Amino acid sequence: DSVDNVVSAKADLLKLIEKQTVKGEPRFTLEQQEYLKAQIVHLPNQSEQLLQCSDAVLNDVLIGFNLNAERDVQAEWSAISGLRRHASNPEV
Amino acid sequence: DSVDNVVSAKADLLKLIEKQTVKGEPRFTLEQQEYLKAQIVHLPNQSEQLLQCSDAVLNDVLIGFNLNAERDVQAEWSAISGLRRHASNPEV
DNA sequence: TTATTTTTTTT
DNA sequence: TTATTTTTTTT
Numbered sequence: 001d002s003v004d005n006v007v008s009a010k011a012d013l014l015k016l017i018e019k020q021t022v023k024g025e026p027r028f029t030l031e032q033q034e035y036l037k038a039q040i041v042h043l044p045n046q047s048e049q050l051l052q053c054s055d056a057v058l059n060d061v062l063i064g065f066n067l068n069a070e071r072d073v074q075a076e077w078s079a080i081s082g083l084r085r086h087a088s089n090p091e092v
Numbered sequence: 093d094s095v096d097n098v099v100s101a102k103a104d105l106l107k108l109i110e111k112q113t114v115k116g117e118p119r120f121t122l123e124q125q126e127y128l129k130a131q132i133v134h135l136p137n138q139s140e141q142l143l144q145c146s147d148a149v150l151n152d153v154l155i156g157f158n159l160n161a162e163r164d165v166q167a168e169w170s171a172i173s174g175l176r177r178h179a180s181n182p183e184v
Numbered sequence: 185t186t187a188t189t190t191t192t193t194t195t
Numbered sequence: 196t197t198a199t200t201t202t203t204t205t206t
Contacts, residue, residue, distance in 0.1 A: 001202075001203080002202070002203085003202090003203075045203075045204050045205080046204080046205075047204090047205095078183075079183055082181065082183030082184075083183060083184065086178060086181055086183075086184065089174065089178055091170075091171055091174030091175060091178075092174075092175065092178065092184070093191070093192080094191070094192085095191090095192075137192075137193055137194080138193080138194075139193095139194095
């Protein structure tokens with residue numbers, strides 16, 4: 001039901017992949033551990049999903065789909081790209 | 093056409109009401125000057141009109157029309173009442 | 185051929 | 196009679 005537990009449980013799973021040991025030796029090699037962690041995905045609500053994406057990624061997406069060109073996207077994304085930097089205020 | 097000139101012209105009119113002199117004496121008494129300035133009004137766009145209103149005034153309005161009671165108003169007005177304090181960022 | 189930067193307000 | 200504080204996501 002709760003986001004706080006979805007994220008907590010996901011982190012515990014990654015931790016378990018890190019530190020699970022059998023006969024006293026760590027169960028997975030590093031390439032293996034990166035493999036399993038690759039398979040897990042987490043799906044927040046849309047707004048938080050956006051705010052997770054770094055500016056480089058989203059700019060890359062805008063370029064790749066040439067959506068960098070049209071005005072409404074650029075104005076909107078500029079405003080959002082800004083507020084991040086002062087999201088420390090809960091009101092922001 | 094331009095807001096910068098509407099506000100500039102209004103301020104010049106108030107200044108003229110202040111300092112217009114006839115035969116070397118100031119044309120209007122203080123109660124007169126407050127009278128004329130009472131008659132002038134200025135009508136910005138809606139958003140700036142809101143941001144001019146002090147929190148006390150808008151809270152008084154919300155109370156007088158009991159709109160203080162309903163949730164959407166309070167959430168929205170709280171958010172706006174906040175951002176003002178950090179409107180120094182143009183992005184905000 | 186001609187050859188840019190622009191304002192305002194509301195939904 | 197019974198007697199509150201609550202989460203999440205999208206439009």
